[PDB]
Amino acid sequence: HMTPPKAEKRPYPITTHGDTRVDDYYWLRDDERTDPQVLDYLQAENAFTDAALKPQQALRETLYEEMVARENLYFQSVPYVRHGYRYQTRFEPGNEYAIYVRQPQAESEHWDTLIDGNQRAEQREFYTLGGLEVSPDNQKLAVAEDFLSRRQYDIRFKNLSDDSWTDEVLENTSGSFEWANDSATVYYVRKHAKTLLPYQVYRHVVGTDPQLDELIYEEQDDTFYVGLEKTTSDRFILIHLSSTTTSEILLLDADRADSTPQMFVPRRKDHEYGIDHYHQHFYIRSNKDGKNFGLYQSEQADEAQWQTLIAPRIEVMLEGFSLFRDWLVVEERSEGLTQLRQIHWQSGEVKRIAFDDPTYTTWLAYNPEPETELLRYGYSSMTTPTTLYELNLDSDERVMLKQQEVKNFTPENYRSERVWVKARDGVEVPVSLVYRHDSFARGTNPLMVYGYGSYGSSMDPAFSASRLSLLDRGFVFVLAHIRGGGELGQLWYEDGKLFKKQNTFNDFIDVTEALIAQGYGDAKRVFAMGGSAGGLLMGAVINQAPELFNGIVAQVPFVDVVTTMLDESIPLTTGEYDEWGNPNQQAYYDYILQYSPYDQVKAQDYPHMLVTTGLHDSQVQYWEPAKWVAKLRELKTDDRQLLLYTDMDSGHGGKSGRFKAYEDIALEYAFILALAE
Numbered sequence: 001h002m003t004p005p006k007a008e009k010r011p012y013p014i015t016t017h018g019d020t021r022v023d024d025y026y027w028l029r030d031d032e033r034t035d036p037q038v039l040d041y042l043q044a045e046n047a048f049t050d051a052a053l054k055p056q057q058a059l060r061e062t063l064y065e066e067m068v069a070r071e072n073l074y075f076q077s078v079p080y081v082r083h084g085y086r087y088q089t090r091f092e093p094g095n096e097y098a099i100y101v102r103q104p105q106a107e108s109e110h111w112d113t114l115i116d117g118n119q120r121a122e123q124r125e126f127y128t129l130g131g132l133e134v135s136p137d138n139q140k141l142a143v144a145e146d147f148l149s150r151r152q153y154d155i156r157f158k159n160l161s162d163d164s165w166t167d168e169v170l171e172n173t174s175g176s177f178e179w180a181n182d183s184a185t186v187y188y189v190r191k192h193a194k195t196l197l198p199y200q201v202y203r204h205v206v207g208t209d210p211q212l213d214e215l216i217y218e219e220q221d222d223t224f225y226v227g228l229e230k231t232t233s234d235r236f237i238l239i240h241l242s243s244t245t246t247s248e249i250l251l252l253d254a255d256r257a258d259s260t261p262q263m264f265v266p267r268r269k270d271h272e273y274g275i276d277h278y279h280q281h282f283y284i285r286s287n288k289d290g291k292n293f294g295l296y297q298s299e300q301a302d303e304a305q306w307q308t309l310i311a312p313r314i315e316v317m318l319e320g321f322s323l324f325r326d327w328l329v330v331e332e333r334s335e336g337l338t339q340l341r342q343i344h345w346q347s348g349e350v351k352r353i354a355f356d357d358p359t360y361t362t363w364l365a366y367n368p369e370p371e372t373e374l375l376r377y378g379y380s381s382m383t384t385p386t387t388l389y390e391l392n393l394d395s396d397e398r399v400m401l402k403q404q405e406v407k408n409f410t411p412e413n414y415r416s417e418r419v420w421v422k423a424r425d426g427v428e429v430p431v432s433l434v435y436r437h438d439s440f441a442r443g444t445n446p447l448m449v450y451g452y453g454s455y456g457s458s459m460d461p462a463f464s465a466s467r468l469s470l471l472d473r474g475f476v477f478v479l480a481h482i483r484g485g486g487e488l489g490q491l492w493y494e495d496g497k498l499f500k501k502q503n504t505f506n507d508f509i510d511v512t513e514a515l516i517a518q519g520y521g522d523a524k525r526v527f528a529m530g531g532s533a534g535g536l537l538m539g540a541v542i543n544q545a546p547e548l549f550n551g552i553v554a555q556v557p558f559v560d561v562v563t564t565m566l567d568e569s570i571p572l573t574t575g576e577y578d579e580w581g582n583p584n585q586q587a588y589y590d591y592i593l594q595y596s597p598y599d600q601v602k603a604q605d606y607p608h609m610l611v612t613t614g615l616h617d618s619q620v621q622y623w624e625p626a627k628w629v630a631k632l633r634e635l636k637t638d639d640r641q642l643l644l645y646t647d648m649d650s651g652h653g654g655k656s657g658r659f660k661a662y663e664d665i666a667l668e669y670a671f672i673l674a675l676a677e
């Protein structure tokens with residue numbers, strides 16, 4: 001019925017390597033965000049989406065209500081102990097924000113409020129708590145807060161003796177800070193006042209005018225993130241410098257006055273390392289000798305003196321480690337599973353943590369004190385809501401500390417499988433899927449296939465409460481563990497980026513085709529979703545295999561890839577040459593252009609699609625999805641649904657916006673369910 005919005009065409013030629021591309025919608029980019037013609041097109045598309053989805057209002061309400069009905073209003077964190085105090089985080093129904101409390105470890109009865117987010121948010125438009133830490137002497141609270149929504153954190157200090165605040169604010173910080181052992185000095189990271197990248201380390205004396213703060217270090221390469229850490233031993237504060245490929249650490253003596261940074265290992269392209277310090281040794285996770293990382297012990301910085309504890313292995317990715325009195329614990333990936341292993345410092349005894357589930361994830365949880373035999377670790381599966389366990393590393397006694405509460409949920413109603421798909425190049429691609437048993441009939445259920453596939457980020461199999469709204473309406477829900485992700489380690493990542501990026505899209509198509517061929521779902525009712533770099537996935541797969549999918553949800557999608565990667569004025573671009581490549585080089589221009597979804601839109605039939613973006617914030621800038629929809633409307637030959645939904649909100653809510661997050665999920669799921677009917 002209704003005529004969709006038609007963006008004005010303004011042919012804008014871009015010539016690179018002699019190749020002229022004509023962009024009719026280049027003008028939808030307005031960095032100042034005030035062009036009235038640009039806002040008219042976004043608003044027009046919002047009105048069209050509103051109009052087209054109006055019949056789905058009742059379904060959106062039903063979905064919203066059933067999603068919120070699974071969740072407990074009252075949430076209390078698992079208490080932890082640090083420096084002789086016990087800490088809990090509390091959410092009350094009709095409180096917008098968490099309250100952070102504590103008590104002395106030997107106390108049971110009384111809890112003291114550290115910070116009430118509801119009191120801090122009073123008379124403000126926006127509030128996000130970026131982080132919180134009491135000083136070693138238990139007397140001062142440091143907090144990083146954003147009142148403006150720009151992810152620029154103010155750091156302030158509270159005297160816990162009388163609940164008074166000090167007079168100073170540390171402004172435009174990353175929220176990264178560490179206490180010196182004097183409980184009087186803090187190190188913090190300042191963002192660049194233009195690019196907002198973290199780039200300077202300052203030393204501040206609490207109570208004092210920040211004009212007196214000393215500049216400790218400035219990073220000259222803005223592809224390197226600047227973070228601060230504190231070692232398990234408390235002996236060093238670390239300046240942690242890292243790009244996508246390359247690390248460097250500098251050490252600050254946490255005990256002595258006037259510390260200056262001490263080099264650990266000077267940066268070297270493609271050497272990624274991270275350190276800790278404990279038991280008078282440095283512990284180093286490093287890829288110096290293999291892409292899957294090894295763990296080393298050293299007395300000194302000198303890389304030539306690093307002793308091998310765990311050699312890099314082709315079959316096992318080393319992700320991280322924690323240090324305890326008697327045990328090393330590592331988190332690893334092997335054969336498409338996450339795993340924890342513990343190794344005794346003295347006996348060399350190795351233990352593996354056993355589970356029994358085809359599609360689960362396990363990880364090291366928060367372990368702030370090393371002088372303990374108790375390990376806290378997380379678990380989640382497609383069928384088992386997220387759980388925190390405490391394991392005695394000596395006795396193997398495993399105790400549940402907390403389970404995610406899911407109302408109106410019977411876990412035995414659902415089944416999950418791990419499936420391996422031989423891809424078109426013969427590489428085995430893992431898949432994790434879950435469905436409701438009593439509505440499953442082979443070849444008849446709609447599929448929802450979810451992928452990401454960039455940055456070596458893994459779409460680890462884990463429990464989703466909102467997902468039950470699809471499973472309880474007959475959907476088979478699929479995680480496709482495609483190349484460019486991290487599920488099979490660093491080589492799985494490298495075989496899905498740069499001159500291998502097309503493998504991500506091929507793997508998504510190959511998994512989808514296999515699951516249809518094998519009878520997991522209805523060939524006519526296959527749906528897909530991905531966001532950001534997963535939106536690039538959605539955009540490439542519908543250009544390449546438009547007939548495979550009934551309908552698509554592309555969130556904040558990265559689709560204008562060649563044009564964006566040619567322009568260093570766009571945020572992310574300078575830091576993403578080691579992901580997609582640098583199209584200033586003809587080899588990368590050609591390789592990227594081949595999949596760049598905006599460039600490869602053709603006059604062909606597409607699936608139904610809902611596309612989302614945001615005006616006021618961005619990771620992908622709002623214009624890429626708007627230009628993409630404009631071009632799809634111009635060229636596509638089908639009469640299927642194409643909708644753009646642009647978030648106009650001037651900012652966020654409680655840590656993201658929970659009400660809003662469920663409203664967004666309900667709108668997307670109603671769109672998909674209406675197509676599946």
